[PDB]
Design a protein around this nucleic acid. Structure first.
Lengths: 88, 129, 224
RNA sequence: GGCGUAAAGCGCACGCAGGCGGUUUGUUAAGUCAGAUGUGAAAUCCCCGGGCUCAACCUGGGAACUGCAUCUGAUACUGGCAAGCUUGAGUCUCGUAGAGGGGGGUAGAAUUCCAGGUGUAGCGGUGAAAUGCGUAGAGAUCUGGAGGAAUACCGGUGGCGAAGGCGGCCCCCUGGACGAAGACUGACGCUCAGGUGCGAAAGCGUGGGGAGCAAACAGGAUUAGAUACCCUGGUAGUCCACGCCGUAAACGAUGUCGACUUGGAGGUUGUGCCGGCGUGGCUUCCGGAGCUAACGCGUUAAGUCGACCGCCUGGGGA
């Protein structure tokens, strides 16, 4: 999991206050950070199916939140997926 | 997930009457209030009130005649998976008129007799007997 | 009778929490040390209007059957029926007293013949062993049926202690439409009782209070 | 209409399309509703009359065609649009327990084997035997060494996991659950054909490893026979890495999600106020109503409901 400092950093970066932790951008960004971090774990631990199910849950949840943001506000969506380096 | 709050309200009424509960409570909605006004005005329930501003809670006071429940049978008819609309000429008769069907018309939620008198059709919400 | 004498003799004290009947919740006041308390404030009026119904019953010469069969309450119910001109049962309620009246009536006649023979010298000309068998049959027929021997037909009312201990008489009455007035504890099922009465149905003091209430009020009804 | 046991819940899931959608207002008027207009050929069905000597038959008159289109209107509900809201769903903080997973390491007990000290005639097996083993010194017992596999006690109708499954100890990487305080987002939800993934054991391929166990096989017994059950050996396999297979009575023979409906006695982990009373999550056993063909299930439903999916339609052939 992400440490407290990493969470605080991303939350300040993508939320529009120090206390905004529920907005779509923060959720998508936290999921993206954990996914990217775990890429190295699953390059070494290919048979770790049980943890990969949680990784896939993060991917599915980020997909859902990104599509929600897209149908709610396109501008914030493109800004997020350019900032986060996501294809779509 | 909850996808038919009207069904939940009919179920709460049915189950409360089967458990001899004096009154039932539930999250409120305007449409539930219209249904309950039809229920109370036709003598199926005793009273209802709404409490709360941001989260209204709707309480229905149930009634029993000789100890036994007044609501003999209540059923959802039109449901989210199968919506049911009838013209004014095809409004159903529940227990040959002893019961009622709650009909939502362009003039509001009313009974089958009232809908027939107003000369309107609409969605058939529930049978109550 | 009233809240004071009930709370003093031990009416209010109920059975343990793990034995209550969820149909007894409304008459429950509260709990203490995992034993229940019966709300006397409801006990008094329902009981007194049951006493009023019974007082009215005896005025129409309606025969009452006293039903209590606990070992320590046999003499209490028998005295209450003895001092009341009534019929009673204080040993095991035979299956068939009420719904099978046609056959129990024959054993009542048999007890009548043995009771004539008992005070008659009939058990002298017999060979001292058939007569002994007659005496033992008399003993058991008194133990069981010696409270309804003169009844002569079905009764009109029932008064019960521990409705579940005597649920067979309750069910027999409900089969025959005899209204029942039963002392219903927290651990009792009242769905078969028309006039129910909460109260400790085991404590001898409370039990003899209910018994004296019904006996005296039936005395009052027959006074009229 | 069904799917615990009669046929029937996919082994388990993620999830596109599809289906369905918490609550407030406005707006639309598509679905829905109302009215009208055009059309829906005649004949036929239906009714009330007539003449065939009556009926068949014919035929006068009268109703239906339950649809489609357009126009005019209503706006409760469903849909679209807009703004919201927080109760659903999710994020954060702190903490809690855990055989959840992947990797590495290590410890003790035991079996087997190798070398050795003591020592002699048995051991081993079984219903009884024999095969086997032992004077070329076994079995027993003591020491040293090698190796593989599994982790006694704890241990628990205990725990964790989507299911399959997961049990010594330590470390590294890692997933989820639950609890209590608030905040934050503001319907972001549920289900899911096709798709994709995971999936016991056995089995397959390549390379290793191999103590014990053990399909096959060999012998000895048993038996009428004994391709068995029992005994003595024993090879694949069981173990490891990677790939494949994709099936089990993969079972609760019970699909997932949400809501509601009397009670009693157990377990486990949180947390509240002073061993005592509160409030949470999962879990055992009984049982009420209800349901059920019955057996039984029974707030962890097989009860009362809603959303979606999967499946069944006599036995055999199959």
């Amino acid at each position: 999991s992400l440490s407290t400092e990493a969470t605080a950093k991303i939350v300040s970066e993508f939320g529009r206050d120090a206390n905004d932790t529920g907005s779509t951008e923060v959720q998508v960004a936290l999921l993206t950070a954990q996914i990217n971090h775990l890429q190295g774990h699953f390059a070494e631990h290919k048979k770790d199916h049980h943890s990969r199910r949680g990784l896939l849950r993060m991917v599915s949840q980020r997909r859902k939140l990104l599509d929600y943001l897209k149908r709610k506000d396109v501008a914030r969506y493109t800004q997020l997926i350019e900032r986060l380096g996501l294809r779509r | 997930s909850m996808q038919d709050p009207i069904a939940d309200m009919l179920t709460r009424i049915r189950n409360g009457q089967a458990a001899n509960k004096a009154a039932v409570t539930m999250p409120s909605s305007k449409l539930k209030v219209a249904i309950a006004n039809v229920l109370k005005e036709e003598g199926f329930i005793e009273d209802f009130k709404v409490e709360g501003d941001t989260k209204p809670e709707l309480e229905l006071t149930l009634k029993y005649f000789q100890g036994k429940a007044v609501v003999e049978s209540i059923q959802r008819v039109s449901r989210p998976g199968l919506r049911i609309y009838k013209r004014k000429d095809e409004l159903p008769k529940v227990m040959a008129g002893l019961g009622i069907a709650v009909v939502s018309t362009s003039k509001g939620v009313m009974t089958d007799r009232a809908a027939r008198q107003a000369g309107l059709g609409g969605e058939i919400i529930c049978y109550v007997a | 009778v009233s809240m004071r004498d009930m709370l003093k003799a031990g009416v209010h004290f109920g059975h343990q929490t793990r034995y209550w009947n969820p149909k007894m919740k409304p008459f429950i006041f509260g709990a203490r040390n995992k034993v229940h308390i019966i709300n006397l404030e409801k006990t008094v009026p329902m009981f007194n209007e049951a006493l009023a119904e019974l007082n009215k019953i005896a005025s129409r010469k309606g025969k009452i059957l006293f039903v209590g069969t606990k070992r320590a309450a046999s003499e209490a119910v028998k005295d209450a029926a003895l001092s009341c001109d009534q019929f009673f049962v204080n040993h095991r309620w035979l299956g068939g007293m009420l719904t099978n009246w046609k056959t129990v009536r024959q054993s009542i006649k048999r007890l009548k013949d043995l009771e004539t023979q008992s005070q008659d010298g009939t058990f002298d000309k017999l060979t001292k062993k058939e007569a002994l068998m007659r005496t033992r049959e008399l003993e058991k027929l008194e133990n069981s049926l010696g409270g309804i021997k003169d009844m002569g037909g079905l009764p009109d009312a029932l008064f019960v202690i521990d409705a579940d201990h005597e649920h067979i008489a309750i069910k027999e009455a409900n089969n025959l439409g005899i209204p029942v007035f039963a002392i219903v504890d927290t651990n009792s099922d009242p769905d078969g009782v028309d006039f129910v009465i909460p109260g400790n149905d085991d404590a001898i003091r409370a039990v003899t209070l209910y018994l004296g209430a019904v006996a005296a009020t039936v005395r009052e009804g027959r006074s009229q």
